[PDB]
Write a protein that binds this ligand. Structure first.
Ligand code: HEM
Ligand SMILES: *[C@@H]1O[C@H](CO)[C@@H](O)[C@H](O)[C@H]1NC(C)=O
Ligand SMILES: *[C@@H]1O[C@H](CO)[C@@H](O)[C@H](O)[C@H]1NC(C)=O
Ligand SMILES: *[C@@H]1O[C@H](CO)[C@@H](O)[C@H](O)[C@H]1NC(C)=O
Ligand SMILES: *[C@@H]1O[C@H](CO)[C@@H](O)[C@H](O)[C@H]1NC(C)=O
Ligand SMILES: *[C@@H]1O[C@H](CO)[C@@H](O)[C@H](O)[C@H]1NC(C)=O
Ligand SMILES: Oc1cccc2ccccc12
Ligand SMILES: Oc1cccc2ccccc12
Ligand SMILES: [Cl-]
Ligand SMILES: [Mg+2]
Length: 324
């Protein structure tokens, strides 16, 4: 079962004796998420970067005070499209035999590195998949984050910086990635993610939304908590996302095989239709990976889809692609 919320959600030291940072060993997997990467590199998750959904939910709550609903939604969304539903294992990065025997095509079980399932374009510190690497820390992109922090955040990363950088990244992908896609699930996650450094990488004794660049580099590049890092003082995920959207409101769309051809997609969900984002994720994205599953897969899909629905913001109706 998905873990419940923390019994005690106070700020506390999370870079502690039981959770030291260690460098990668051969075979250890890190991916496009600096949060999960850091949890793995401090042993909140298995240090090889392969974990169960329950391990992931417990780690994001314990290590960073990610809220339960967001933890559940993200984890089961990722697991459904990138994880092995039979073995209950998900790679936080590149596809690995460690997640076990694969299901039939067209399912990929590609880990979080898979492009276009969860991971997508206009990431802050990772390049678009089209440019060759959607997962490793990129120094040039991080230096741009520092520059935007200097220009809009007084040297710190905050929601104002997020609003400007989010837009810059979109516009750079429009200008250079002929395959740029910015619809549906990615349209939502691209905004929320930009709040996470301000909400979750800021020491919880401050919780002031102003992330310094030394801490930012430590998390984004080295998957390492600052010495003496306290987690956030209460559960939170994407609060302040409205600031980021309001800075430069966008419509969902994509380039259409050429640069500078961004074309709005009226079939995509947007922030006015959050339930549509959920329904399309299940009916189209998940169903297309598993169009006619065999018995054990069908049962695992339905279980994980029920868990996903627990993380859906209130008011949406559950959909059942494989029946009830
Ligand atoms: C709850 C389970 C989570 C999963 C499965 C997950 C997975 C992912 C994935 C696949 C991405 C790539 C999005 C992209 O293409 O840019 C991403 C982005 C990101 N995640 Fe998470 N994430 C989770 C929770 C968290 C938490 C708790 C934090 C912070 C503590 C966090 C911080 C970030 C950041 C900062 C980015 C954007 C990095 C960048 O653009 O350079 N995530 N996440
Ligand atoms: C919760 O944890 C905090 C910090 O570890 C501690 O001070 C407090 O006594 C615990 N109990 C409650 C209910 O806050
Ligand atoms: C290009 O976008 C398509 C969907 O429009 C996606 O299937 C594919 O993985 C993307 N390729 C790259 C390398 O960006
Ligand atoms: C990092 O991002 C920059 C700017 O988009 C790009 O030129 C470069 O190919 C990427 N990779 C490396 C290793 O810098
Ligand atoms: C970010 O920092 C800048 C400069 O200190 C400040 O003007 C702005 O109000 C801050 N934004 C947020 C959302 O804290
Ligand atoms: C998803 O499929 C369900 C039937 O299982 C249907 O009721 C619903 O309208 C569909 N949603 C979308 C957005 O296709
Ligand atoms: O927008 C989001 C909401 C909740 C969780 C997320 C995890 C990763 C990336 C984006 C997320
Ligand atoms: O309201 C939201 C919009 C987009 C992404 C989010 C991620 C987490 C939590 C809330 C989010
Ligand atoms: Cl919570
Ligand atoms: Mg990306």
């Amino acid at each position: 079962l998905p873990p419940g919320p923390l019994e005690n959600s106070s700020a506390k030291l999370v870079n502690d004796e039981a959770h030291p940072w260690k460098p990668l060993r051969p075979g250890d997997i890190r991916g496009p998420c600096p949060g999960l990467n850091t949890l793995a590199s401090h042993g909140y998750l298995p240090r090889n970067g392969v974990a169960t959904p329950a391990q992931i939910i417990n780690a994001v709550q314990e290590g960073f005070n990610f809220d339960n609903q967001a933890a559940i939604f993200a984890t089961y969304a990722a697991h459904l499209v990138d994880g092995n539903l039979i073995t209950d294992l998900l790679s936080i990065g590149r596809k690995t035999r460690l997640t076990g025997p694969d299901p039939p095509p067209p399912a990929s079980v590609g880990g979080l590195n898979e492009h276009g399932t969860f991971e997508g374009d206009a990431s802050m510190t990772r390049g678009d998949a089209f440019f060759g690497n959607n997962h490793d820390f990129n120094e040039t992109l991080f230096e741009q984050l520092v520059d935007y922090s200097n220009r809009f955040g007084g040297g710190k990363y905050n929601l104002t910086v997020a609003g400007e950088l989010r837009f810059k990244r979109i516009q750079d992908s429009i200008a250079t990635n002929p395959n740029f896609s910015f619809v549906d699930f990615r349209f939502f996650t691209a905004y929320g993610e930009t709040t996470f450094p301000a909400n979750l990488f800021v020491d919880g004794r401050r919780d002031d939304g102003q992330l310094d660049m030394d801490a930012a580099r430590s998390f984004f590049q080295f998957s390492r908590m600052p010495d003496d890092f306290f987690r956030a003082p209460s559960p939170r995920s994407g609060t302040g996302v409205e600031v980021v959207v309001q800075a430069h409101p966008m419509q969902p769309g994509r380039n259409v095989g050429k640069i500078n051809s961004y074309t709005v997609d009226p079939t995509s969900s947007d922030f006015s239709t959050p339930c549509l984002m959920y329904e399309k994720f299940v009916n189209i994205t998940v169903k297309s990976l598993y169009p006619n599953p065999t018995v054990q897969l069908r049962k695992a899909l339905n279980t994980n889809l029920d868990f996903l629905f627990q993380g859906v913001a209130a008011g949406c109706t559950q959909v059942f692609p494989y029946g009830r």
